[PDB]
Amino acid sequence: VEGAVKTEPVDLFHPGFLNSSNYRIPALFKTKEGTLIASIDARRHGGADAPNNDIDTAVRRSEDGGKTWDEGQIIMDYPDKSSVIDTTLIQDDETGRIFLLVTHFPSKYGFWNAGLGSGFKNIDGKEYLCLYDSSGKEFTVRENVVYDKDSNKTEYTTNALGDLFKNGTKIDNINSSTAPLKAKGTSYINLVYSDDDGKTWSEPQNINFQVKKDWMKFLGIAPGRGIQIKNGEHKGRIVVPVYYTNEKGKQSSAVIYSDDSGKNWTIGESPNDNRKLENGKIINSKTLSDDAPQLTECQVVEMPNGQLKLFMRNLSGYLNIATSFDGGATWDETVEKDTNVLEPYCQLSVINYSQKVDGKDAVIFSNPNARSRSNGTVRIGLINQVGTYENGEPKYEFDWKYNKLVKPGYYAYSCLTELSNGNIGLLYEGTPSEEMSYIEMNLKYLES
Ligand SMILES: CC(=O)N[C@H]1[C@H]([C@H](O)[C@H](O)CO)O[C@@](O)(C(=O)O)C[C@@H]1O
Ligand SMILES: [Ca+2]
Ligand SMILES: [Ca+2]
User: Which UniProt keywords apply (predicted)?
Assistant: First the structure.
């Protein structure tokens, strides 16, 4: 229709960009300055997940609203098939700091074979990364100095990237397959930040010691974006979707969050903790032993009063939505199944939108609208209060009033952003692991 905008796709990442053969897992975010940041996995040896790859994190920026993009940079690169996989972007509006978080595995490890726990040990009230030698002896890293089990200083030190130094000379990296001292083979959550609008980034912080429990095997970023709460008692809290497995391998979603501008982090409960299933059975993420109630990758949005909604990948075939009254610390016992939105067991994107649509607060949603990874569809969901919970809190559901096919054929992971002009940017997997496509759409298009 006249005035509708749906730009022709641009291959924002593609084979050969930054000398990477493959790409997957988009994240897209507009900074407070108006810059678009796109992050992605630069998968160097094909499309496969860790551990069958060597994956780096790449970033591109656009200062002109997505019309032109920079030459990119690699911001995290570990050696020897140690991978960083699944990025997420968020910003602290009060400081201007941009955060990127990602899951990190040492060489040989990934989702399926992650070891139990954080990889840290408490010594006299501080958490220290453990290292292991060839015989299984345990060491700790204390302010980047390696101590043996008897609390004697060794000749080894580390840095934030895991390089291993013997008397100040680099000999290996604790994430490699060859180092004489290795980190535990499990997932770690890495955090980097930028104070210059994404131009430069810090070296990673390993926040596992704060967010990963002793009974979790995998704990990973749920890729896409986070939020900063705008309304209510938890205003300012930075919320980052995650998911984990228990000792039985079963997956549950959650959020990690920070009340101090990213300095310290906490993991909240899962919606699977004290979840009431359809006919009244109560489960818990620690004990979940069945595949059917699993909740995996997820993205979060905020309701007008500050209530959180966690949109989750799951095994029901349809969207699942959890509700939190307390800023992501806990969730209501009922997980909604929204049978108006197919969910083929794939990542999804959902964002708040800044302007009302048809008199209602609205969200924008993207996923493959099928029983397979196809029929990529962007939706406008109008928020309606439908009653109240027993505790008096408002109960909100979505009216998926506008639903637009944007990508016939293959469509897998995606990430949305609102643009400075009120339009919508979208970065999506329109191929399995090669070209990653960026488009801009306006609401005239989406509503047509
Ligand atoms: C850390 C990791 O493996 N992340 C990968 C996840 C997990 O394997 C599943 O969510 C486990 O259930 O799934 C993908 O394979 C997928 O479905 O396309 C891509 C993503 O990079
Ligand atoms: Ca690498
Ligand atoms: Ca609960």
Answer: Calcium, Glycosidase, Hydrolase, Metal-binding, Repeat, Signal
Q: Is 211 in the pocket of ligand 1 (CB under 6 A)?
A: no
Which numbered atom of ligand 1 lies nearest the CA of 24?
A: 21
Which atom number of ligand 1 is nearest to the Cα of residue 313? Answer: 10
Residue 172 assigned to a binding site: no
Q: Structure tokens of 87?
A: 């990025």
* Residue 374, number of CB atoms within 10 A of its CB: 16
361 annotated to bind ligand: no
CB distance 86 to ligand 1 below 6 Å: yes
Closest ligand to C-alpha of residue 411 is 1
108 DSSP β-pair partners: none
Tokens 């040896």, located at residue: 45
Residues with catalytic function: 49, 297
| CB distance 336 to ligand 1 below 6 Å | no
Domains and CATH numbers, the chain: 1-118+185-448 (2.120.10.10), 119-184 (2.40.220.10)
Under 8 Å between Cβ of 155 and 163? no
Q: For ligand 1, atom 19, name the residue with the nearest CA.
A: 49
d(CA 314, CA 291): 10
What CA–CA distance (Å, rounded) separates 37 from 66? 9
Distances 88 to 240, 273, 300, 374, 428 between C-alpha atoms, Å: 8, 24, 12, 23, 14
Q: In 10 A of CB 77, how many CB atoms?
A: 16
Q: Give me the sheet containing 83-91, strands edge to edge.
A: 205-206, 188-194, 98-105, 83-91, 224-225
d(CA 49, ligand 1 centre) in Å: 7
Residue 273 is labelled as binding a ligand: yes
Residue with tokens 């959902």: 350
How would DSSP label each residue in 17-70? GGG-SEEEEEEEEE-TTS-EEEEEEEETTSSPPTTSS-EEEEEEEESSTTSS--
Dist CA 313 CA 309 (whole Å): 13
Task: State which approach was used to obtain the coordinates.
Answer: X-ray
Please name the residue whose Cα sits nearest to atom 14 of ligand 1. Answer: 49
- 388 beta partners: 394
Element (H, E) at 165: strand 163-166
For the Cβ of 103 lying below 6 angstroms from any atom of ligand 1, the answer is yes
Residue 334 DSSP one-character state = P
